[PDB]
Amino acid sequence: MEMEKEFEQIDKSGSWAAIYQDIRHEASDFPSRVAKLPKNKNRNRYRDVSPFDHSRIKLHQEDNDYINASLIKMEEAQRSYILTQGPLPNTVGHFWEMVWEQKSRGVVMLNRVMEKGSLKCAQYWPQKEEKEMIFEDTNLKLTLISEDIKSYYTVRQLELENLTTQETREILHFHYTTWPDFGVPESPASFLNFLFKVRESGSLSPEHGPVVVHCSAGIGRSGTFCLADTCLLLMDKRKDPSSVDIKKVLLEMRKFRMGLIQTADQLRFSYLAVIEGAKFIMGD
């Protein structure tokens, strides 16, 4: 059923809350035993948001391999994503270790360091060229190379150096800076523009490791980003673009990380970004 018509039918009936609860009820439940070990309590930002054991990213160290991060593997779309929480003061070194080990090209950040007067994630990248960051626990160095500040997002070029081998890589930081403190954006225009800039970079391409995507918990805004991307890529690839069922795509993604899309408003917004993206590829 054309997701456009399904969208008007839900809006006219005001049933967003009822669709959203049906998704929550049918979503997968898998064990997260590593996340709940006592040695990992300070590695988790939220007690109710954990990676499943089957899909968690492992750090390449014998001490403790745990990070709050999940590999989303979309078989039909041939797209992969690492969804993770905003780094904590004691997990900034782990975060950059994961970027290095997974061979990611891009980091996508969908939150501000402070929102609603509280800290949502650590200041985990350098703000001045001449003041680099060293992570002594994981033996990495991170330098700001350049910064391009636009109205709705900032793109940064970073240099990550493995101090053990003296290899360096260029990492692109895509920072969406205008998501509102409450609710969702009124138009998906600036979000959809951001996604297309991420893609243009090569960060979402198979010659690199998976893109790292985060917000504060790594499930809400982060969920919207990967759902929108996968949706639009399937429409490009299938003989019948109207066969793309956003609710079925979201349940497949929830096999890999719990809680993706946190509210009925984010579901509606996810619907709108895809419908608007659809109504733009066609040349509306």
Ligand X SMILES: NNC(=O)c1ccccc1OCc1ccccc1
Nearer to ligand X, 212 or 215 (CB): 212
Strand 79-84 and strand 66-74: the pairing is antiparallel
Q: Looking at 80, 111, 222, 270, which residue binds ligand X (CB under 6 A)?
A: 80
Nearer to ligand X, 204 or 234 (CB): 204
3-state helix/strand/coil string of 105-124: CEEEECCCCEECCEECCCCC
Q: Looking at 206, 239, 240, 283, which residue binds ligand X (CB under 6 A)?
A: 206
Please report how close the Cβ of residue 78 comes to ligand X at its closest, in angstroms. 4
Q: Do 259 and 217 contact (CB within 8 A), yes or no?
A: yes
Q: Do 249 and 230 contact (CB within 8 A), yes or no?
A: yes
Measured between alpha carbons, how far is 128 from 109 in angstroms, rounded to an integer? 19
- The single residue of 121, 215, 226, 231 carrying the catalytic annotation is 215
Which residue matches tokens 């198979």? 206
Tokens of 209: 């490791």
208 binding ligand X? (CB under 6 A): yes
Q: Does 121 participate in catalysis according to the annotation? A: no
211 binding ligand X? (CB under 6 A): yes
Please report how close the Cβ of residue 109 comes to ligand X at its closest, in angstroms. 17
Taking CB under 6 A as the binding criterion, the range among 76-84, 109-117, 157-165, 226-234 that sits at the site for ligand X is 76-84
Cα separations in angstroms, 100 against 2, 137, 255: 41, 14, 26
Nearer to ligand X, 197 or 208 (CB): 208
Q: How many CA atoms lie within 13 A of 55 on its CB side?
A: 25
Most distant pair of Cα atoms in the chain: their distance: 60
If we measure between CA atoms, which residue out of 253, 250, 208, 194 comes closest to residue 23? 250
Q: Looking at 78, 127, 178, 242, which residue binds ligand X (CB under 6 A)?
A: 78
Contacts (Cβ under 8 Å, ≥6 apart) of 247: 19, 23
Please report how close the Cβ of residue 255 comes to ligand X at its closest, in angstroms. 14
Annotate each residue in 3-32 with x if it binds ligand X (CB under 6 A) or - if it does not, as one string. Answer: ------------------------------
Q: Looking at 88, 198, 204, 219, which residue binds ligand X (CB under 6 A)?
A: 204
Please give the span between the terminal C-alpha atoms of the chain, in angstroms, as a whole number.
20
Q: Looking at 51, 87, 209, 218, which residue binds ligand X (CB under 6 A)?
A: 209
243 binding ligand X? (CB under 6 A): no
Please report how close the Cβ of residue 256 comes to ligand X at its closest, in angstroms. 11
Annotated binding site for substrate: 181, 215-221, 262
73 binding ligand X? (CB under 6 A): yes
Contact residues for ligand X, defined by CB under 6 A: 73-75, 78-80, 204-206, 208-211
Active site residue ranges: 215
